[PDB]
Design a protein around this ligand. Sequence first.
Ligand SMILES: [Bi+3]
Ligand SMILES: [Cl-]
Ligand SMILES: [Cl-]
Ligand SMILES: [Cl-]
Ligand SMILES: [Cl-]
Ligand SMILES: [Cl-]
Ligand code: NA
Ligand SMILES: [Zn+2]
Ligand SMILES: [Zn+2]
Lengths: 106, 106, 106
Amino acid sequence: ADWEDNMETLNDNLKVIEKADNAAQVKDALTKMRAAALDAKKATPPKLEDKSPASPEMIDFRVGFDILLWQIHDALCLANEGKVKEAQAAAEQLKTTVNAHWQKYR
Amino acid sequence: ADWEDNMETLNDNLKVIEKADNAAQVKDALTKMRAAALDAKKATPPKLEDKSPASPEMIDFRVGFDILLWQIHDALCLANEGKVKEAQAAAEQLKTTVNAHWQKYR
Amino acid sequence: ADWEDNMETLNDNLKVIEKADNAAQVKDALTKMRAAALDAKKATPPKLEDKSPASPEMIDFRVGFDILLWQIHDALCLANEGKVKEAQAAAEQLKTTVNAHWQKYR
Ligand SMILES: [Bi+3]
Ligand SMILES: [Cl-]
Ligand SMILES: [Cl-]
Ligand SMILES: [Cl-]
Ligand SMILES: [Cl-]
Ligand SMILES: [Cl-]
Ligand code: NA
Ligand SMILES: [Zn+2]
Ligand SMILES: [Zn+2]
C-alpha cells in the first residue's frame, strides 16, 4: 500500500485497540499495525518523491517506522501476556508517535 | 555470508524447529535464523545483482528481511514463554516467508 | 542529538545497568538504550561523512544498528522475566558491541 493508506491502517487499528474487549482483538490489531509499518518502509511520502531513496530524509522516514515497530513490539508482547490495559496504554503512546510521523512527512 | 548461504541457514533451522523437542532448541534455532536474516540484509541476492544498493528494489529486499525478522520474533516470544508447540506452529509462517523470498530473489 | 551523543547515551545507560539492583531499573535503562540506538541509526557517522548516502558502507552501518537493537531486545527480555543478573551479564556483552561500533565509525 502507499504511505497514506498504510497510515490509515495504523490509525484504524489504534481505534480497534482503544475499543477492544479482549486480548485476541488487541493482538490482531497490533499484528495489522506491524504489517502496515513494515509495508510503509517501502513507500515514499509525496513531499520526498524528489529525494534520493537513501537520502538522509528517506533514512529518517524509514527509521521512524522502526521506532514505531519497536513500540508495537512492546504493546504486542503485553497483549500476548494478557496485559490488555498496559497494551492499550502503550497504544496511546503509539498514537502520539504515529501522529508525529504523519505531521513530519505529510 | 552471501545470500544463498544465509538462505541455507534459514531452511536448515526451520527443519530443526519442526523436529525440536524443547524450548531451548527452538530458541537456539530461531536465534540462528535471526543472525542469518540480519546478515542477509547486507547481501545482494542473485536477481538484484543488476541493481544498485540503494535502489528501491534493494530497499524492498531489505524490508523483506525486516518482515522475516519480526515473524521470527513471534516464534521467539512464544518459545521464551515456553510454549513450544505454539512456537513451532509460528515457524510454519516462517517457512512460507522464506520460500517466497527464495523464489523471488534467486 | 548527533551520532556521538547517542553513543554517549548508550554508555551512560550501560553504567546505569551495571550498578542496578532490580529489574525495573535495568528495563528503564535498556529502553533508553533502544531509543538512542534508533536515533543513531538515522545518522551519518564521522568516518562515513565522505561517502555517498547510497553507499554500501552506510547500509552496513544501519544493519549493524539492527544487530545491536536485537541484542538490546534480548537483554530486555531477560529483565522482563525478572532475571536481573542474567540481564546485567548480557548488558556487559552489549558494552563490547556498543563501544566497538563507536570506535569503528568515529
Ligand atoms: Bi520476550
Ligand atoms: Cl537504505
Ligand atoms: Cl533504512
Ligand atoms: Cl518480548
Ligand atoms: Cl532499507
Ligand atoms: Cl539499511
Ligand atoms: Na552454498
Ligand atoms: Zn535501509
Ligand atoms: Zn520480544
